[PDB]
């Protein structure tokens, strides 16, 4: 039954990613005056089906390359990483409970550095290395940055088992408790992901693409998570399952929305804006919510 | 007769004004709003926790009175 649940979790991100294609392009097309994909058959999933079909039947460009086998190991790295982390993340009872998985998930992120470094390296030439490596900068400039205001949200939840978090957010959700950490957490997602505003200006440009969607919908299933979700009733999850998955997909389209409508950042406005404005409020908020609980005289009760 | 196109009657107003609404309030309502929705979800949160504390020390005592 387990590999059985293994196959539930890590076959449908094939189906999640290419209908999460089908749906930015439509929600970019009406945030335009657009419509289409929609010619294709009733409104456009066979043409995602279509074109992830013919990125595989068209013929790769031969290498020139060097190390093939390092070519070989990098995004075979990165989609490992897409599929393998979707685990401690409960949708209502999660996969593998386990005393700690956030820390893990910071850890995975910085794997997925790895692989970019990888690709970026083993690619081609100079002008891609120096592009490939100032990317690899401004994707390691924030796991300081997401893993200290993780760090300052669950310090009022206590322990890392994310399990006693979906309890504690019963009450209220915790967007109100931290408004501005949770404000600046979603600006480092977007890091993370690394997507407009977040410049970015080879192969397998599917394997790429499918790693970087699959990391979009993870860190934001672990944003519905993080932050909020309504109360669990045992022996129906049903319930929860709808309403985690909705409050997900708004987020999610909220996400693309914010792509939608910015202009890219200049690099070096980009590292001013993280260090000089984020961190030192980062570091305010961390020990702000150090200095509280002492002060409601309500530390999380650590099992 | 004659048939060009002159405009007929003379055509009415065509605005051109920045006109931006300034939607929203004064920053200083903005700062009590989040300070007072931040302080509401401070107290439900200590409420909440020491509601779990009350039910930590009972497991606790489920733990003591179980265990020779
Ligand atoms: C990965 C990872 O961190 O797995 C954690 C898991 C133990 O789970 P943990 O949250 O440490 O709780 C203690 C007992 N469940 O760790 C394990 O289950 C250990 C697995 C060891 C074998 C695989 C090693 C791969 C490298």
Redesign the interface.
Known sequence: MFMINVLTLIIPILLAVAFLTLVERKVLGYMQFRKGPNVVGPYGLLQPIADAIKLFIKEPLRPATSSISMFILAPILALTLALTMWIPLPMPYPLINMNLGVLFMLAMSSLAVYSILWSGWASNSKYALIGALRAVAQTISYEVTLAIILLSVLL?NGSFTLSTLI??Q???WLI??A?PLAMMWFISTLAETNRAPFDLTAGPFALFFMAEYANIIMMNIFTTTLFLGAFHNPYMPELYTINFTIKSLLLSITFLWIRASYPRFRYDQLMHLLWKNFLPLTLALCMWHVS??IL??????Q? | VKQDMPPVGGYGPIDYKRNLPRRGLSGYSMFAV?IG??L???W???????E??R??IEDFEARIALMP
């Open positions: 009022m309890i504690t019963e009450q209220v109100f408790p408004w509280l609980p409601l005289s309500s530390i999380p009760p099992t | 989040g929705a931040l509401f979800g401070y439900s949160m200590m409420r909440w926790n020491r779990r504390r039910l930590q």
